[PDB]
């Protein structure tokens, strides 16, 4: 039933973020526009292995998010953990919708290392509106062990929220750039979301996803190496990462830190080259085009130049908030730009919510 819902970053692991866009009126005209945004560092013990495992504490945190937001809306879209979802493509024959859903569940049954006991939702990589009966089916299945979804629904229920869409982050992060992707439509673009628990790669022709792949490595790895090499707590190692790696006065600390994070840098580069090579299936004689970055782990200083020179692709930060109207009297464009990578998904399923 129509409200403009809301959007949290429920699988932030490092941070629970939430965004309210609705249609803001100006001079008798209206359009999607940022209304509020809030961010709180996730209190751990909330999430373990991608499952919400202190539904109570997470509830209270989300309530703090709603209060800091000053939002009256109580409907929400959210996302599952990349560690909690299996995403992969699947080839079938299209037919009746029931026969597809059953046949889909039958093929993915092979694909799921758990009982069902499992969440199945598909979408077709090409418009069904393009092919004849019995021919040329392609769906991609998102499958999730059951009570990742439960845990999240409990969290949402006691926060006073009502969920309408439980989406996935690798595609929700794309809704902000889906327009700017939709304008070049034979161009192959990569989108990396380097988070704290996982790094997702999704590669597209236009805003048409060609594939996705999720890598266990993330910013938690950089923080954890910093912590190992200086017997620091996770928080002070995280700050040493953030402010340590990027200050103008940091000239003495990129040896001490960079020597700590160098293994992670090499090995992340190895994983990304890994996935990219594992895609290049059909065009044995071509090259790449252009790619963007999201998630706070991206904001590692100089990491964009490193990925650019190492993967042979131009890797650029992007401002999601360009998709939405921003009142300059309520929001500074500079800070908005600063927190854009963390918030990409956080506005992602948020354009999913007035949709």
């Amino acid at each position: 039933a129509k409200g403009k819902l809301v959007l949290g970053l429920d699988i932030g692991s490092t941070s629970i973020k939430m965004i309210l866009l609705k249609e803001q009126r100006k001079r008798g005209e209206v359009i999607y526009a940022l209304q509020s945004f809030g961010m709180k560092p996730l209190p751990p013990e909330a999430i373990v292995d991608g499952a919400l495992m202190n539904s109570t504490a997470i509830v209270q945190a989300v309530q703090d998010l709603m209060s800091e937001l000053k939002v009256k809306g109580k409907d929400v879209a959210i996302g599952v953990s990349g560690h909690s979802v299996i995403i992969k493509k699947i080839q079938m024959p299209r037919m009746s919708q029931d026969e597809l859903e059953e046949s889909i569940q039958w093929e993915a049954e092979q694909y799921i290392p758990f009982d069902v006991k499992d969440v199945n939702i598909d979408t077709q990589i090409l418009d069904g509106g393009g092919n004849d009966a019995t021919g040329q089916m392609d769906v991609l299945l998102v499958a999730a062990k059951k009570d990742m979804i439960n845990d999240y629904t409990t969290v949402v229920s006691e926060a006073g929220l009502a969920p309408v869409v439980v989406d996935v982050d690798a595609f929700a992060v794309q809704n902000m750039f889906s327009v700017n992707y939709d304008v070049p439509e034979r161009e192959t673009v990569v989108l990396i979301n380097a988070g704290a628990s996982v790094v997702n790669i999704n590669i597209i022709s236009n805003g048409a996803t060609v594939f996705t792949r999720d890598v266990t490595i993330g910013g938690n790895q950089f923080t954890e190496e910093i912590q190992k090499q200086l017997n620091v707590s996770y928080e002070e190692a995280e700050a040493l990462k953030i402010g340590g790696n990027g200050a103008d006065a940091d000239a003495v600390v990129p040896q001490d830190v960079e020597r700590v994070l160098s293994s992670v840098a090499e090995q992340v580069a190895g994983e990304i080259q890994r996935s990219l090579d594992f895609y290049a299936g059909t065009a044995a004689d071509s090259n790449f085009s252009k790619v963007y970055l999201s998630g706070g782990t991206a904001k590692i200083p100089a990491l964009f130049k490193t990925i650019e020179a190492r993967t042979g692709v131009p890797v650029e930060i992007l401002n999601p908030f360009r998709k939405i109207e921003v009142d300059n009297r309520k929001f500074d464009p500079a800070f908005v730009m600063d927190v854009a990578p963390m918030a990409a998904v956080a506005v992602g399923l948020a354009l999913r919510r007035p949709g």
Partner: protein, 314 residues
Amino acid sequence: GFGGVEGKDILVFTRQFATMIDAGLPLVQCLDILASQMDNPSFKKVLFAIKSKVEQGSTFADALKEHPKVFDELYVQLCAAGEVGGILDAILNRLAAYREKNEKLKSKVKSALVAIGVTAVLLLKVTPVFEKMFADFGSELPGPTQMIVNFSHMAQEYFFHVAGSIVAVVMSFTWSYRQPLFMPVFGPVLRKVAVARFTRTLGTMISSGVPILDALDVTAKTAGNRTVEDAIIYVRGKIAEGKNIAGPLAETKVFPSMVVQMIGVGEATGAMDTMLNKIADFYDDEVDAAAMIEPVLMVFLGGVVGGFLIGMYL
């Protein structure tokens, strides 16, 4: 005013369509084949008309709609549900099993509200009515009471006869409900039904023009009895290796000497289609003859009636 078709004749034709469609033949070619293999004209004639609508591009459900007196609303909706969901093959298999259960259930009340419902009320109380009516010929019979007793005591003494009537009922209900260590020795093997279905399916796909090996690969996926499925996988594996069809069959007890000898002619004659069609018709008629489901009715029918009458007299 138009009537449907017989329970037998719906059966044969729904089975043979389910079989051809699950073989991956085009629906129109399935339709052509069963029409061209039919013995009654009214079936061959309809099925040409159903096929004529399917070649104009209509669904099978919408093509069968031209014969609503033959394929009822529940049948078409099952077809149309299969067509809408991409499961036409498995809903036709369901419909074939349905039609088979319907024909068997028909023969088997009638033998010795439709006709089955009206005949089954009518048989279940015939006797117990006889009974109440001999026991209503006046007063002072065998086992009664005088009418002046108090009603409750009169009714309780007769409880004997109320009981002999209910038992009579339970019996005729049982006959109508039933009636429509070497571990491997205990498994249900192939029956007459399962051989008749096999033979019809193969007679059907061969008469249509499919090779033997294409027909066997389809059939080995649509055989219901597990031991027969294991038999047929072995027959197909043997034939695909270059062994002669009659020789793969001769290894399995379910095929008589006559069946094998007849198939062995059909191999040398390029007439297997029809050898199988005549075998299948012979089996289908042997099946529908197979008669103890009606004699045992009558044993319990009059045997219970007579037990009641004896009961109170004594």
